[PDB]
Amino acid sequence: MLKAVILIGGPQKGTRFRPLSFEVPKPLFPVAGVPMIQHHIEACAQVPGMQEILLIGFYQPDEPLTQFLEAAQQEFNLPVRYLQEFAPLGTGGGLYHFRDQILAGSPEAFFVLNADVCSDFPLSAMLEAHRRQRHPFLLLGTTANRTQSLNYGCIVENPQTHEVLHYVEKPSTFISDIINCGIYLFSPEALKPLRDVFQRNQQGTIRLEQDVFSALAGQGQIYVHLTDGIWSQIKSAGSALYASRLYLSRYQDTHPERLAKHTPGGPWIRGNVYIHPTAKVAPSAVLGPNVSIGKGVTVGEGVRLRESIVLHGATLQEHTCVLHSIVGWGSTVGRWARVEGTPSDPNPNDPRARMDSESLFKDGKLLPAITILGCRVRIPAEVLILNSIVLPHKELSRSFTNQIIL
Amino acid sequence: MKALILVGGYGTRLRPLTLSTPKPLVDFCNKPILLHQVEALAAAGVDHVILAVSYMSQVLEKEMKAQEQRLGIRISMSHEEEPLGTAGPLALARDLLSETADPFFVLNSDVICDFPFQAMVQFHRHHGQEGSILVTKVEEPSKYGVVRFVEKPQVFVSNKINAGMYILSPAVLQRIQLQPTSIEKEVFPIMAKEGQLYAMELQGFWMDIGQPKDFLTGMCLFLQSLRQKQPERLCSGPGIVGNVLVDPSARIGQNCSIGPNVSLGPGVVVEDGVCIRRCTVLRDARIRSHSWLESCIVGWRCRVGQWVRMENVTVLGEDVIVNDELYLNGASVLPHKSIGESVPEPRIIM
Numbered sequence: 001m002l003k004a005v006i007l008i009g010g011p012q013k014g015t016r017f018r019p020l021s022f023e024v025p026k027p028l029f030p031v032a033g034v035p036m037i038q039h040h041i042e043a044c045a046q047v048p049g050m051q052e053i054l055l056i057g058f059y060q061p062d063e064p065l066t067q068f069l070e071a072a073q074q075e076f077n078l079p080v081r082y083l084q085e086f087a088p089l090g091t092g093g094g095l096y097h098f099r100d101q102i103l104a105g106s107p108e109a110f111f112v113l114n115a116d117v118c119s120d121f122p123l124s125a126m127l128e129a130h131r132r133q134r135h136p137f138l139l140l141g142t143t144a145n146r147t148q149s150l151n152y153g154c155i156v157e158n159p160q161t162h163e164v165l166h167y168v169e170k171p172s173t174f175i176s177d178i179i180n181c182g183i184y185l186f187s188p189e190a191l192k193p194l195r196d197v198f199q200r201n202q203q204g205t206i207r208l209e210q211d212v213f214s215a216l217a218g219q220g221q222i223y224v225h226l227t228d229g230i231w232s233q234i235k236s237a238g239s240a241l242y243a244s245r246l247y248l249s250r251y252q253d254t255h256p257e258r259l260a261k262h263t264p265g266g267p268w269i270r271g272n273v274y275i276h277p278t279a280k281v282a283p284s285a286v287l288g289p290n291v292s293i294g295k296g297v298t299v300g301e302g303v304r305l306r307e308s309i310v311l312h313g314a315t316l317q318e319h320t321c322v323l324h325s326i327v328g329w330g331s332t333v334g335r336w337a338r339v340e341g342t343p344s345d346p347n348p349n350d351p352r353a354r355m356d357s358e359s360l361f362k363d364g365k366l367l368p369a370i371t372i373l374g375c376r377v378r379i380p381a382e383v384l385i386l387n388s389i390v391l392p393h394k395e396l397s398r399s400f401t402n403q404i405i406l
Numbered sequence: 407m408k409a410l411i412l413v414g415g416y417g418t419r420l421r422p423l424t425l426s427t428p429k430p431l432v433d434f435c436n437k438p439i440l441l442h443q444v445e446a447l448a449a450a451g452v453d454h455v456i457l458a459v460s461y462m463s464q465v466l467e468k469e470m471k472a473q474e475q476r477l478g479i480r481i482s483m484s485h486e487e488e489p490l491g492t493a494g495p496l497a498l499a500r501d502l503l504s505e506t507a508d509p510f511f512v513l514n515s516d517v518i519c520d521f522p523f524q525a526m527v528q529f530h531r532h533h534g535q536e537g538s539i540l541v542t543k544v545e546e547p548s549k550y551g552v553v554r555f556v557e558k559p560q561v562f563v564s565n566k567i568n569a570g571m572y573i574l575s576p577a578v579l580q581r582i583q584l585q586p587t588s589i590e591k592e593v594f595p596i597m598a599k600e601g602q603l604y605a606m607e608l609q610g611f612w613m614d615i616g617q618p619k620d621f622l623t624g625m626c627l628f629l630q631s632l633r634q635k636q637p638e639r640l641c642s643g644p645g646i647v648g649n650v651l652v653d654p655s656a657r658i659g660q661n662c663s664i665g666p667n668v669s670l671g672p673g674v675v676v677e678d679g680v681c682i683r684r685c686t687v688l689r690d691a692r693i694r695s696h697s698w699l700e701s702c703i704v705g706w707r708c709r710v711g712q713w714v715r716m717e718n719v720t721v722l723g724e725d726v727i728v729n730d731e732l733y734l735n736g737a738s739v740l741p742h743k744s745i746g747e748s749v750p751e752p753r754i755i756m
């Protein structure tokens with residue numbers, strides 16, 4: 001038997017995902033219709049031998065997290081527990097702090113997944129490689145562009161034994177095309193270096209990449225497993241859109257009943273579109289590629305929706321165009337209003353993609369990105385929101401362009 | 407009494423539209439602006455008008471030699487080899503403007519007004535002097551030439567612009583030279599040092615429509631005067647807001663909101679759910695569904711796609727295909743352009 005540890009963050013790691021995170025926690029943001037960690041729990045309960053799923057984070061258990069945990073426990077036939085760490089303990093410090101609960105029942109190995117990644121999660125093939133080799137650390141790696149790889153944790157390996165010889169968390173200079181994916185397979189022996197790291201701290205917070213992956217690289221403990229299935233990070237509020245698009249593309253294999261079909265008496269559907277059943281979509285509303293509709297969403301007639309997330313309880317009145325946007329919970333977009341953004345994906349194989357920095361401005365100018373509307377934002381009739389971020393509970397009366405509307 | 411119209415000068419303001427048809431032949435509220443001026447002249451009692459014509463001669467040959475039978479008056483065309491200023495008109499046409507020794511009107515073509523010609527001949531016969539001009543009070547004097555005489559003061563020396571209407575007795579006719587001079591700039595200066603020109607002001611509704619923003623403001627004012635004088639002209643209905651001037655050939659779909667100050671040309675197809683305010687849509691221009699247009703000029707035979715938001719004085723030239731779900735803000739699009747990408751900046755598309 002095995003178990004999974006999904007490292008969800010806490011409220012400080014959700015600061016970068018801020019317009020969206022004001023209402024829900026970041027790991028519960030619905031990416032292609034289901035919350036962000038439900039893709040992880042989906043992929044982990046698909047593995048034969050999964051006993052437990054242990055979320056580690058420093059979120060307080062509010063109503064949405066505990067209701068999600070009970071819903072995941074019923075839907076996925078597993079005990080899904082939430083281990084709240086007493087302090088922000090870094091990446092590996094919460095795995096070392098909870099080692100008695102992780103190793104309870106003596107699992108053969110355990111997965112360690114970052115909650116902010118979108119992946120196909122090739123957990124079975126990682127397990128095949130681990131049961132072949134039996135090493136302390138198995139990392140998942142992807143190939144990136146040489147220019148984009150500097151935004152990520154670079155891995156220099158040995159292409160015959162697949163041993164990580166070098167690891168650097170964000171190098172200024174080129175190191176390697178292999179980037180860490182935030183998916184790991186630890187054996188129980190892997191909790192013995194972390195102990196050492198913690199003991200060296202006494203002369204509690206352990207960063208897994210800077211203190212364990214970069215230290216034991218080349219000593220025989222850390223190994224790679226490569227893929228090139230889908231992979232994305234979700235850091236800012238608008239990388240949720242790229243993650244949603246990748247997931248809606250892989251629903252063509254894993255859940256094709258989530259994807260909506262045209263059915264000539266209904267709304268006109270291009271590309272991959274998720275529509276929740278509670279949503280009412282008018283038959284003249286064409287829903288373009290990579291759209292996901294939340295529950296309780298009333299989409300009026302003639303509404304064009306392309307490359308967007310419309311969250312729960314939102315309302316798009318007649319003849320609206322919503323492109324590359326995230327319409328928040330309960331937001332209302334009046335008739336002939338245009339909410340337009342600019343596509344900006346992380347995409348580590350795109351040589352023109354931005355670094356996904358925390359600074360949204362270059363020199364006073366807001367860089368063109370996804371248009372985020374917070375919850376309860378009333379966009380008036382006949383008005384354009386272009387490349388803007390609107391903070392929650394803001395009733396607007398005016399056209400806004402390249403602005404953060406506080 | 408005869409009359410003179412100045413026409414032909416390249417319309418370098420109103421520039422996307424005036425590469426296609428000349429500035430007199432741009433249909434201003436379903437009627438060419440030269441047709442506006444000559445119908446008001448032929449109703450005012452002038453028997454004979456002379457069109458100075460230099461730029462785009464042949465299409466004006468066609469339109470005016472086909473409209474002379476409609477007005478009931480005579481029109482003599484005076485074509486030149488060179489575009490000769492604003493006074494070279496009179497010096498070529500000196501032999502038939504001094505036929506009878508009568509004061510003659512001199513009209514700008516880019517001016518649309520309540521043409522007060524009847525009161526103005528009465529004004530002209532009372533000071534006995536050589537020329538008398540139409541003036542209009544304008545509440546912002548720095549962009550405009552006030553009348554002493556200056557041309558671009560930006561000082562507030564006076565408050566009232568020249569309105570492009572003159573009457574000239576034939577003493578100024580053999581005064582000007584044949585080689586090109588512009589009669590408003592330096593002929594009017596020595597006219598002012600002479601003391602022969604006078605100022606008469608009218609009550610309201612003037613507009614020069616040489617610039618596209620000014621073209622749209624002239625449309626709003628003309629639709630107001632068409633609401634007042636002839637309320638049977640304007641359209642009515644539930645989906646109609648404000649003063650909408652639909653041609654009988656133009657067809658509008660259902661659950662639209664064709665808002666205030668819209669003038670649809672002959673033959674336009676507005677599909678189901680367009681929202682137009684403050685726009686001029688010209689002949690044969692098709693505007694597809696769920697589009698939103700405000701303060702824009704759609705030229706002849708354009709296609710506007712669906713979910714297109716056009717605004718802020720976007721001017722489309724002849725036969726421009728805007729693709730679907732785009733956004734144009736100040737795009738001054740040249741003729742025979744298709745547009746595949748948004749224009750969020752006031753720009754000129756080549």
Ligand SMILES: Nc1nc2c(ncn2[C@@H]2O[C@H](COP(=O)(O)OP(=O)(O)OP(=O)(O)O)[C@@H](O)[C@H]2O)c(=O)[nH]1
Nearest residue numbers: 007008009056057088089090091094114115116209
């Ligand atoms: N449980 C828990 N999880 C964490 C904590 N910090 C980070 N994580 C998770 O692990 C991932 C690592 O994020 P970061 O702490 O920003 O580290 P990084 O991705 O290596 O990038 P850097 O900021 O350059 O260090 C986060 O996206 C969270 O999913 C923590 O303190 N507790």
Ligand SMILES: Nc1nc2c(ncn2[C@@H]2O[C@H](COP(=O)(O)OP(=O)(O)OP(=O)(O)O)[C@@H](O)[C@H]2O)c(=O)[nH]1
Nearest residue numbers: 412413414415416417418458459460489490491515
């Ligand atoms: N026949 C003729 N008419 C002219 C000539 N120059 C100007 N005009 C007329 O002058 C009239 C009014 O002058 P403007 O309002 O300045 O128009 P414009 O000639 O197009 O000049 P722009 O300021 O470049 O637009 C126009 O209708 C022209 O037809 C010319 O050289 N020959």
